[PDB]
Write a protein that binds this DNA or RNA. Structure first.
Ligand SMILES: [Mg+2]
Ligand SMILES: [Mg+2]
Ligand SMILES: [Mg+2]
Ligand SMILES: [Mg+2]
Ligand SMILES: [Mg+2]
Ligand SMILES: [Mg+2]
Ligand SMILES: [Mg+2]
Ligand SMILES: [Mg+2]
Ligand SMILES: [Mg+2]
Ligand SMILES: [Mg+2]
Ligand SMILES: [Mg+2]
Ligand SMILES: [Mg+2]
Ligand SMILES: [Mg+2]
Ligand SMILES: [Mg+2]
Ligand SMILES: [Mg+2]
Ligand SMILES: [Mg+2]
Ligand SMILES: [Mg+2]
Ligand SMILES: [Mg+2]
Ligand SMILES: [Mg+2]
Ligand SMILES: [Mg+2]
Ligand SMILES: [Mg+2]
Ligand SMILES: [Mg+2]
Ligand SMILES: [Mg+2]
Ligand SMILES: [Mg+2]
Ligand SMILES: [Mg+2]
Ligand SMILES: [Mg+2]
Ligand SMILES: [Mg+2]
Ligand SMILES: [Mg+2]
Ligand SMILES: [Mg+2]
Ligand SMILES: [Mg+2]
Ligand SMILES: [Mg+2]
Ligand SMILES: [Mg+2]
Ligand SMILES: [Mg+2]
Ligand SMILES: [Mg+2]
Ligand SMILES: [Mg+2]
Ligand SMILES: [Mg+2]
Ligand SMILES: [Mg+2]
Ligand SMILES: [Mg+2]
Ligand SMILES: [Mg+2]
Ligand SMILES: [Mg+2]
Ligand SMILES: [Mg+2]
Ligand SMILES: [Mg+2]
Ligand SMILES: [Mg+2]
Ligand SMILES: [Mg+2]
Ligand SMILES: [Mg+2]
Ligand SMILES: [Mg+2]
Ligand SMILES: [Mg+2]
Ligand SMILES: [Mg+2]
Ligand SMILES: [Mg+2]
Ligand SMILES: [Mg+2]
Ligand SMILES: [Mg+2]
Ligand SMILES: [Mg+2]
Ligand SMILES: [Mg+2]
Ligand SMILES: [Mg+2]
Ligand SMILES: [Mg+2]
Ligand SMILES: [Mg+2]
Ligand SMILES: [Mg+2]
Ligand SMILES: [Mg+2]
Ligand SMILES: [Mg+2]
Ligand SMILES: [Mg+2]
Ligand SMILES: [Mg+2]
Ligand SMILES: [Mg+2]
Ligand SMILES: [Mg+2]
Ligand SMILES: [Mg+2]
Ligand SMILES: [Mg+2]
Ligand SMILES: [Mg+2]
Ligand SMILES: [Mg+2]
Ligand SMILES: [Mg+2]
Ligand SMILES: [Mg+2]
Ligand SMILES: [Mg+2]
Ligand SMILES: [Mg+2]
Ligand SMILES: [Mg+2]
Ligand SMILES: [Mg+2]
Ligand SMILES: [Mg+2]
Ligand SMILES: [Mg+2]
Ligand SMILES: [Mg+2]
Ligand SMILES: [Mg+2]
Ligand SMILES: [Mg+2]
Ligand SMILES: [Mg+2]
Ligand SMILES: [Mg+2]
Ligand SMILES: [Mg+2]
Ligand SMILES: [Mg+2]
Lengths: 96, 275, 88
RNA sequence: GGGGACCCACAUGGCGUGUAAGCCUUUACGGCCCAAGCGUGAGUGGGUGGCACAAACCAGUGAGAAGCGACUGUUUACUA
RNA sequence: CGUGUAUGUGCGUCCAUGAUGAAUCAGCGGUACUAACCAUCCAAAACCACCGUGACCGCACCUUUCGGGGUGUGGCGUUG
RNA sequence: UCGAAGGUGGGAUCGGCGAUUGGGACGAAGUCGUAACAAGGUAGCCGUACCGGAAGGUGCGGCUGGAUC
RNA sequence: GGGAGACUGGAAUUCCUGGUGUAGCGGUGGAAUGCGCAGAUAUCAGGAGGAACACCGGUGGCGAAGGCGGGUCUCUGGGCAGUAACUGACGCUGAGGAGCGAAAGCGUGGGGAGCGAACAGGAUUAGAUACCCUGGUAGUCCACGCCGUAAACGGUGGGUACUAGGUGUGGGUUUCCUUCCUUGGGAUCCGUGCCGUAGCUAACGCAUUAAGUACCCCGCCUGGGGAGUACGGCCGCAAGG
RNA sequence: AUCAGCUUGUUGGUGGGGUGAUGGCCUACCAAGGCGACGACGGGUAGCCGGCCUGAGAGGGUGACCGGCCACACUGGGAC
């Protein structure tokens, strides 16, 4: 029950439309477990600083999460396992 | 873990064993036991095929589901992680949902209570066998097969198992415990996680009775062998044979790997030791 | 570290009244809950010497408080030690 | 290094077993005790005999150094 | 252990009580095929303003006797 | 029964001597060396491990009781 | 940057593979052992593995002290300010005892890119078993145990109360020129640098973060070698303490 | 403490003997403890005190003579 900030970068081979269904399906596990609140905003197609995974561009998605550490760890484990994702992290919105 | 035995007798002073606190049942399933016997290091022909081994403690056999492919889509809980001495590792029986129980190799850190799936939908907890189509590159794997569906043969060492490197085209690359890379099909069967009993390497043998039990026979050194019996034979005193060591069977140290295997083209380079 | 919910629950539930918080009873209650919880944590985390320092400090502090309770009143000391089920 | 045999007393002693009888009940090929009966070691005193009281048979010699081999093991059946 | 006698309990096939079960016609999963509405982030067919100037046209100074060349500004063009 | 003296047997302390060996100090003067004191010509020292007739050298970590810039 | 576990990032070194590309590359006060003509150096592409986190980064923060810094998560200690609700002599230091502890060293089992004792050569010197160059075995990394010593220094044990200031930094409460932006101004407590009174000290020097003036307890010292050594005792498998 | 545990009539109670007098002073029977880091048990030295010397004092050294006790009579014991 603590506010979390997560950003997800996806491979550019996927179109912009598929991102929203993919992200909502990914976070349905947290939606159905803790009864949480979320906020989603999207902006993609930015030139990357360097090559990552032999790729030059990507899409950025940022979600504000108010959930359980177990739930966010489960999302991280389920999501980093995916091949279409490149880099992710989770932070604390509050003081710590 | 590891428990060291106190020196009650001069013989068992150094004997230390890996205490098997990972045991749950003591009497193995009677249905799956097949008739087996110590072959004594001899073929049916009667000649001793390989010395230094044979005799000892007659033991039973049990079928392990090394090649688990027949049933998929059904879960199974860890029934009882019992002890099978016919292997360095342990075997943990499973209650599958169809009621057909098979032994499997017990991976590292497996305790009773986890649910194991064997198929495409299986997740990444250890004990899940699944083809390379459904595994990330870089995960530690064990009980690895060589073709899509012909029975698994490799990667069953206790403590260190094969590590997947990457997939390109229809061929997948596997890293060996020796530090080598082998090319293998992207559709072979492989499990996730290391194999348990990593502390078994910390076992201390202890005496000769345990060893006749385990199977090996005492080793006879060539330098005291007779010259007719061995190229190292002969001498009045201790002599090394006056020549480089050679197996008394004719060939000395050197290359033994006959090339041109069907998987020789599926190997990049050979092992290099002590680097 | 304990937080508001369970900590106010403990201070009230072992409190002499509904307002007092610094009573030795509540102090020992907080110390005991902290030590069992974080000892459970250290049963997993072995080599946290900086936290074992906290263990030893809080335990000596606890020992001083228990000695004070025993000195001031034997009956309250016995009641406290019996209600928490410890040895001393 | 000391005691060890026999007799008496402590001793109708302690211990085990367990009948009659007693206690009890889901009453039975039932649980508790158990006078009586049977078996029974241990010790302390007093006395006695012989040169000698584990008296027969049976039944470790001990101690101090140093060499080799860690030890239990196996081998030149029929010279080691 | 193994063969037979037939009487007594006694059972259906050829009647039929029970327990059920299953291979047939008529549509739906606010989810949400298709012209939009409200809210949010970015930019392809360069409009306005400044700055840097491939290269071009040159004004003033320095430099070898004049030459190359260097320094400030203007007109664009935009290697970008 | 006790009982001093005497004799059996193995443990502690004080010792005396003991081939030879290890170390230390004082002699005076000689060979081998340059160690330290000035950025002593490789900054010094401390803990530690290895090496070398010798003072010492090196590795790792720590201090400035180190001079220039 | 308090500690522990897990996940993850980039640059660099080395090695391997494949182009291109030619006779040198590396080296010091100078040169030679070193690798090349079997194709080095250089350079591009890819991969592998191990260590450590340049800038921020400071006479700055934290920790009791050793020490501590790529990010992310997980759990957790310590400290600080205000309200002051409550406990009402619980405070301090602490012989013997117990726990933590730089690097190196040891056992077991793994790892091992770079660096680097030992050891080979090449170089200087009358001489080098060193300083210099080319290589490189332990170790340096990981997990579990061990030894428990450092110029372990602020060469100053801790705690409390008092005693003139100036100049920076960090953290938090307030109030007022008030834009109410402002290291604006003021008050307050904690931490940390520098210079300075009275005072102390043999001097250098310390100077509210005292070596100032005192109180409480604890360890240590009584001329230099012998000697932090022999014996004895304790710990450690040993080195050894 | 470069001496950390000591003790078995040892400790305590009861009943007997014992001695001028109470008492493990001696015996029997019951229980397991007492002394121990505010230095026990061990090791070396030595008669103690009023006094003497030194020092302003504190203190340090010491036990000549005399005098108050203590212990011994070649060594070890025992008793009238
Ligand atoms: Mg042994
Ligand atoms: Mg079998
Ligand atoms: Mg034949
Ligand atoms: Mg063999
Ligand atoms: Mg046999
Ligand atoms: Mg096994
Ligand atoms: Mg052999
Ligand atoms: Mg032989
Ligand atoms: Mg031959
Ligand atoms: Mg033969
Ligand atoms: Mg021979
Ligand atoms: Mg010979
Ligand atoms: Mg050979
Ligand atoms: Mg290999
Ligand atoms: Mg906290
Ligand atoms: Mg009976
Ligand atoms: Mg009755
Ligand atoms: Mg009953
Ligand atoms: Mg006689
Ligand atoms: Mg034998
Ligand atoms: Mg033998
Ligand atoms: Mg034979
Ligand atoms: Mg013979
Ligand atoms: Mg024979
Ligand atoms: Mg013989
Ligand atoms: Mg002597
Ligand atoms: Mg002598
Ligand atoms: Mg000279
Ligand atoms: Mg010098
Ligand atoms: Mg020199
Ligand atoms: Mg020097
Ligand atoms: Mg020096
Ligand atoms: Mg040293
Ligand atoms: Mg060296
Ligand atoms: Mg250093
Ligand atoms: Mg100096
Ligand atoms: Mg850890
Ligand atoms: Mg290449
Ligand atoms: Mg290259
Ligand atoms: Mg490596
Ligand atoms: Mg009040
Ligand atoms: Mg305090
Ligand atoms: Mg204290
Ligand atoms: Mg104290
Ligand atoms: Mg002490
Ligand atoms: Mg102390
Ligand atoms: Mg400890
Ligand atoms: Mg310890
Ligand atoms: Mg180190
Ligand atoms: Mg270390
Ligand atoms: Mg060593
Ligand atoms: Mg080790
Ligand atoms: Mg090793
Ligand atoms: Mg090197
Ligand atoms: Mg070097
Ligand atoms: Mg060589
Ligand atoms: Mg050399
Ligand atoms: Mg010291
Ligand atoms: Mg330090
Ligand atoms: Mg200190
Ligand atoms: Mg103080
Ligand atoms: Mg202040
Ligand atoms: Mg003054
Ligand atoms: Mg003065
Ligand atoms: Mg000052
Ligand atoms: Mg002060
Ligand atoms: Mg002073
Ligand atoms: Mg000397
Ligand atoms: Mg000394
Ligand atoms: Mg000694
Ligand atoms: Mg009496
Ligand atoms: Mg009386
Ligand atoms: Mg008495
Ligand atoms: Mg008596
Ligand atoms: Mg006097
Ligand atoms: Mg005086
Ligand atoms: Mg005096
Ligand atoms: Mg006197
Ligand atoms: Mg007189
Ligand atoms: Mg008198
Ligand atoms: Mg006498
Ligand atoms: Mg006498």
């Amino acid at each position: 029950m603590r506010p979390y900030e997560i950003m997800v970068i996806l491979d550019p081979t996927l179109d912009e439309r598929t991102v929203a269904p993919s992200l909502e399906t990914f976070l349905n596990v947290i939606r159905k477990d803790g009864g949480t609140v979320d906020k989603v905003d999207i902006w993609g197609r930015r030139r990357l600083a360097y090559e990552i995974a032999k790729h030059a561009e990507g899409i950025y998605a940022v979600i504000d999460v108010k959930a359980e550490p177990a739930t966010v760890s489960e999302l991280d484990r389920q999501l980093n396992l995916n091949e279409s994702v490149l880099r992710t992290k989770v932070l604390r919105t509050d003081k710590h | 873990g590891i428990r060291k035995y106190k020196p009650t007798t001069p013989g068992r002073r150094g004997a230390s064993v890996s205490d098997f606190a990972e045991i749950t049942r003591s009497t193995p399933e009677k249905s799956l036991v097949r008739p087996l016997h110590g072959k004594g290091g001899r073929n049916a022909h009667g000649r001793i095929t390989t010395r230094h081994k044979g005799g000892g403690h007659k033991r039973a056999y049990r079928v392990i589901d090394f090649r688990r492919h027949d049933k998929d889509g059904v879960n199974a809980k860890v029934a009882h992680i019992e002890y099978d001495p016919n292997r360095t590792a342990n075997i943990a029986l499973l209650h599958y949902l169809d009621g057909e129980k098979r032994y499997i190799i017990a991976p590292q850190g497996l305790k009773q209570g986890d649910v194991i799936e064997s198929g495409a939908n299986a997740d990444i907890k250890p004990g899940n066998n699944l083809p390379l189509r459904n595994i990330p590159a870089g995960t530690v794997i064990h009980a690895v097969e060589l073709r899509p569906g012909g029975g698994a043969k490799l990667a069953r060492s206790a403590g260190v198992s094969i590590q997947l490197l990457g997939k390109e085209g229809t061929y997948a690359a596997l890293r060996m415990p020796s530090g080598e890379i082998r090319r293998v099909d992207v559709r072979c069967r492989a499990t996730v996680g290391e194999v348990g009993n990593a502390e078994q390497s910390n076992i201390n043998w202890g005496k000769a009775g345990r060893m006749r039990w385990k199977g090996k026979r005492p080793t006879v050194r060539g330098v005291v062998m007779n010259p007719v019996d061995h190229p190292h034979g002969g001498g009045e005193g201790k002599t090394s044979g006056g020549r480089h060591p050679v197996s008394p069977w004719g060939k000395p140290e050197g290359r033994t790997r006959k090339p041109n295997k069907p998987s020789d083209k599926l190997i990049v380079r050979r092992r290099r030791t002590g680097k | 570290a304990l937080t508001a919910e369970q900590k106010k629950e403990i201070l009230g539930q072992y409190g002499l009244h509904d307002t007092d918080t610094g009573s030795p009873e509540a102090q020992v209650a907080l110390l005991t809950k902290r030590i069992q919880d974080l000892t459970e944590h250290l049963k997993v985390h072995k080599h946290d010497h900086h936290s074992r320092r906290g263990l030893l400090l809080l335990v000596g502090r606890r020992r001083r408080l228990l000695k004070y309770v025993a000195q001031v009143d034997v009956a309250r000391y016995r009641s406290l030690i019996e209600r928490l089920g410890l040895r001393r």
